[PDB]
Subunit: 465 residues, 4 copies
């Protein structure tokens, strides 16, 4: 069975219980709610439909709330009509939100546009369609020279490569969306356009104020500032979402692949979950099969070591959502099965024990590593070494059981209680057999914390089923 986890964006085509059950069967592990669209009633029934399928089937899944985030956009044009911009012309942005645009000027939504930009900077409009160079900044105007021909429509995204943008961490609507996330008890929040550590702290504080302190934060890295501050962002976050498409608009194209590989490797080492996202199987919005190129990108992303891969429009609104999940699962299984363990700063007890446990499992052809865990840390510490064995993670914590669904190669199981180390061994052997993942005579390695506070893994034990 595959080890890499699949995040599916769920939308109108895929939100029914019937469709969700088929998506789970096909390999979906996590539902993404994209809050760039839909209202609270719609997202609420989506959440309930998934939870209904879970309780009826006993299948497990996690729920991830992806925020819209703050943004810079252009605004309206005369008559609603596109205008044609020409290489070499002068073009001006104004922060006066009342201005209606034309072929010479358009308003932007961001009051700080003049402050943050500098003469010589690049302005990109509409997913990089039209590039411009700032030639002067005067009052509420950023005056530019257009670099290539293109048609400007209304309400288009603006990207400022290499610029530290003083947008707030959270749009006002994002703040209400997070409260909804707390009300609904989602498992993860993916926070958009994270640029610096203080952005993460603000999200953490907002969740804490509404009872969401146990919701894990996945920071979306989308531009050069976020990459520059990656280490501090990761330290403050519970995980990372690699937004390849945004990066390709914002940094030199030849760097994007190494930004992805670096972020995945650092997440692995930090024992934090990483999702790779955008431009995965986009061709399947319209087509029943992906391209060779897309399949190869997915496979290489898995070989890079990602915990999870994410479907966007393909699973939410496209014509072939089940086919997209299925072929994604096929690629995952085919790629996961040729990956090997990775068995490589003063040494901490948890890492010594977990690395040794994986080494022992490999030396003894153990099909399963059973881990006792409260918050998920010990399960993620074992996964760091990419064990051949499946990780059966026993927890009494319902939130942890859902969150571990996102971690590569982990099968979480909720248990009523674990009263002692020896009880853990007895129970874990029972559930190992019940799971069908191991059989009489198989070796299992069992990892837990004994006589220590939650958050430290210190014991490894070898049992025959």
């Amino acid at each position: 069975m595959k080890k890499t986890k699949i995040v599916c964006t769920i939308g109108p085509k895929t939100e029914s219980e019937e469709m969700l059950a088929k998506m789970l069967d096909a390999g979906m592990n996590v539902m993404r709610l994209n809050f760039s669209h839909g209202d609270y009633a719609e997202h609420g029934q989506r959440i309930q439909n998934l939870r209904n399928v879970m309780s009826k089937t006993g299948k497990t899944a996690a729920i991830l709330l992806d925020t819209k985030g703050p943004e810079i956009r252009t605004m309206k044009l005369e008559g609603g009509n596109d205008v044609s911009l020409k290489a070499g012309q002068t073009f001006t942005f104004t922060t006066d939100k009342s201005v209606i645009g034309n072929s010479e000027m358009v308003a932007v939504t961001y009051e700080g546009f003049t402050t943050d930009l500098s003469v010589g900077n690049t302005v990109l409009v509409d997913d990089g369609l039209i590039g411009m160079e700032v030639t002067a900044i005067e009052g509420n105007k950023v005056i530019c020279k257009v670099l290539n021909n293109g048609d400007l429509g209304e309400n288009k995204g603006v990207n400022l490569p290499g610029v530290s943008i003083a947008l707030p961490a959270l749009a006002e609507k994002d703040k209400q969306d997070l409260i909804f996330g707390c009300e609904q008890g989602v498992d993860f929040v993916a926070a958009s356009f994270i640029r610096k550590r203080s952005d993460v702290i603000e999200i953490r504080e907002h969740l804490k104020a509404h009872g969401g302190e146990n919701i894990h934060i996945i920071s979306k890295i989308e531009n050069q500032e976020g990459l520059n501050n990656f280490d501090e962002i990761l330290e403050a976050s519970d995980g990372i979402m690699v937004a390849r498409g945004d990066l390709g608009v914002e940094i030199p194209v030849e760097e994007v692949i190494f930004a992805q590989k670096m972020m995945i490797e650092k997440c692995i080492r930090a024992r934090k979950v990483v999702i790779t996202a955008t431009q995965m199987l986009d061709s399947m919005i319209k087509n029943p099969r992906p391209t060779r190129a897309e399949a190869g990108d997915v496979a290489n992303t898995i070989l890079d070591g990602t915990d999870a891969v994410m479907l966007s429009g393909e699973s939410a609104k496209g014509k072939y959502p089940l086919e997209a999940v299925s072929i994604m699962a096929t690629i995952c299984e085919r790629t996961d099965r040729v990956m090997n363990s990775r068995l490589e700063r003063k040494l901490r007890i948890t890492e010594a024990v977990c690395r040794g446990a994986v080494e022992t499992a490999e030396k003894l052809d153990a099909p399963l590593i059973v881990v006792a865990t409260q918050g998920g840390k010990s399960a993620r510490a074992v996964r760091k070494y990419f064990p051949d064995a499946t990780i059966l993670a026993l927890t009494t914590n319902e939130k942890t059981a859902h969150q571990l669904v996102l971690s590569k190669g982990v099968v979480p199981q909720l248990v009523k209680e674990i009263t002692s180390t020896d009880d853990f061994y007895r129970l874990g052997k029972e559930l190992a057999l019940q799971s069908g993942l191991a059989h009489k005579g198989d070796v299992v390695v069992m990892v837990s914390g004994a006589l220590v506070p939650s958050g430290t893994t210190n014991t490894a034990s070898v049992h025959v089923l």
Copy 2:
């Protein structure tokens, strides 16, 4: 400087001496002549233009002749008009080349179509646009059920996934093209649609009969039969071209990435040159920049270990040929510079010596490995270990000097003579300094064959410049 080599398909936009000089400056190493197009006079002046630039500038390059190859194609339709085929309809192919086609039947160019196919096989038409299933074979007819809607035009390619096709190794025109290659003294022949070892032998025999015995054969692997017979094809060939696009039409999509990775690794181990080709920077036929996806695929292909990457329409006919070469070179340099040596069957002398030479170079921070070579074997034997050092390959053989241009990280240099091992050391130290790749005080490792027949590398020597 980059180590990965760039093959550029040269066409009308890029065949002038002026453009070729700029392509070389931008990182082109090898000219591909695609003999699916153009006549002998055109290819001849292309060859002469490159050779003129080489002699005027002293720059070096190789010339590769890519054959059209045999193929199965559909033929003509009533009035020259496209026909619309519908999912579920019956559709029939006939091997009667006189038949004019319609929405129910079309002729194919291949007399063996009925013989090679079986009930239940898949027929794909026009680069996989329209898929069909064989339901019966009767006389000169292959009767099918169409699997998806699509428009059939005239003269479209046909692919038969998983089928061993009895086309000859060489189309009649290919046979005359190879004679032209011998007349012109090209450095490489890339042979299309290689399915089995006997295909390679036929090409080898045709070249030998026209004085081309020193022309190296790169076999193009395009379908499942060729993959099945890969080991014997590689053994008989001088190198491999991985044709990703053809593979994506012919084998399960999730296997294509591993077919590429496997073929590259086996070529490396065999000390034979590998080119990765098709669907590289195709978006730059129309656009001045590539996509994120394309750049990531190129980088991962280099990380896989390919000797060379190939541009097709982007460099031959597209709008931005110089831009395509430049960004390709940028990706190569950025990716090459983060790759490490790979310092891993009874042991042969050549491999023991060459591996040890690379290990010694690495231990001593040597910027250059100087190799004496007649046919190129010792240079390729060192390159197998992906040395950090540049390989300066001294040869008296003009063909070898050109052929080594395709090998990763090799700088060939033609020398008048090498009379002894000690003379090799004196000359190699001189040319090391002349090359600008090493300076006084640098260590160089010098590899050669002493008192042995050509084809064996047995000596490694460490010198300070």
Copy 3:
């Protein structure tokens, strides 16, 4: 502190409670009783003297009893006087124990001497001092040609290389010593002249018939036959005594050092205890300090990997027993401290124990705490020569004493161990009480959880 253990043969000068306490202070770990001097009352009192010292001082020690093997000896000579034998003369052995010997013939203690020997066999007398070749066998006489000049004394050992001697492993004459050992509850029996596995089984069956099934058998390898059969002897034994001096009588001199090294290595791999003995510090029977040569041999024996070194006359009969123990301990400490772990290992026990040593090394753990019933887990950890001391907790009193012989093990008898978590609690306590580790130190704790005795499957890392 040293890790190599010291076995001291106890004799007249050293059997008092006062002298035994000083020997323990100086580094003695195991008392050997050689059952060729004194009667059972003497031996019983020696045992009691040690046990009094142990209970008074709280110090721990083991008791090793030597059981006699199938040896052949020559007997008495005219007037008690040595005689000179010359190369080429005829010399005759007789099995008539009433004959008093001279320069032409001597008696031997073994009635089967004529039966077991054949024309052409070699007879060696007095640890190979005098070699002879059998030329004829007639009646009760074995007639020989002397091969080299030498002086024959009284009551000398006889070696028959290449001859399988038909005596049993344990003669009825010598079985009472083993029954006495069972009655006294000794920890080890060291069986002399073990030749083959069936000898070991014979001793094992004798012990099991007298309540001694938990007594460990150390097989003494002293002659070529035993060396030839070493692998099967080790498999059947609990441990080995390398008696290099005796072994050297029958095999080529250049082979003896490698016989020692090979036997120690196989014992280590088998997780079975090995004692190296004979010609250790013999010069200290008469002198207050050893020779350079002796100290170097001892050190190299430790570097070979021996669990224990043994003093014989130096501690039993000599003039400087305390000095011998002290310098031996000094050599042990100086050599032990430059030895490193050997971290090459599959079985679960070996995987867990090897990994536990690796983890201890990576985390600078001063101590590995092991729960053990029969001692196997402690010996399984010791196989990798950990830098850390092994604190071995057991409820089994026999095990606690036997582990005293194992390199680098500190045994501790505990009342009970009720669960894995209880073991971690108790072990942290005793680690601190022992003074072998302090607050903040890492200890690695090794045990069997939900498995029968004999399998070690759990390793756990704790901060004191």
Copy 4:
């Protein structure tokens, strides 16, 4: 064949051409002349006898000459009779060489005895048999308290641990021996009681003044001062003689074995030859075979990594010189054959030579052929203890003889080597001629190409 080299001290029983040829046959590689017996005519004839055997038989050997060092000795006693000294008595040393000694006072050979000593220093007599403490110094007298009972004989060595003796490295009395060595063209000088690097330089300057600049200096480490200064002594020397018996007089007994092991290891790393000497097979001065203990010490010395082992009285004065050489060679062969390469190495020479050994091992090469002028490249390959024999081709006759001392090296003098390719041609020929390799075998060939002597930079693999 063995790889460890044997140095034999040659004396009266062994100096004839007949006996020397037999010693070479039995495994002798180097003749040591101890310049304390006989006059120059005797020594010259011994040298000539060996060189006659060499030219007649084509066999090769080296000649090592011992130069005398700053030793102190006691002198004569009344009637030649031993005297008994008792713990606690007063005993007096005098620098008056005319005094004949008794139980109260003896003369010493050294006039500076009173100057160099201080109240409280320890004086050791006769290899530490009798220890004393200085209580006063008055006039020409050093007055002491005897620390232990012992019998004083005539002409005994004196050791002053912790005192730097003010004698020069080479007294004018002892410089003629070194000039004689230069005249005779010996291969090595072994300098006694080297204490510090300036002693080595003093010997080097003396040799350079008499045409002996190409003679190699082996520094003998015999006392605590030399051990303390070992690193600088080795740097200045061409090699080391570990004289464990003498060294053991002044340092703690448990340290001597590690002093030997450490010195051998440092010599190996420095690519400098090391001889282990004293108390090797001394029992064979009187007996036709050695002891187990002696054979084991020799074997462990070889396993430590020594280039050579040395016989002293066993080959010079004893009754069984040929038997001593033979059993030594047997021990060498038996121990050498179980030793493995040590493939840890940056400098170009070390990279190339270590890699050449690795390549030879990977390709099962029986031979590494080295071109060498001064011997450095051959010694650089030997550092890694290759399984392959080292065939060392040189045009330098002194080098050819000196390499005889290096472990596992077969030197061969050749007329000339004109190029790297010529070396490969000649080396393949001589490999086949030598019988050390056969057609089809792989040989690895190591040399310097386009560099000055002293740098090895080329490794080449050939099939014979």
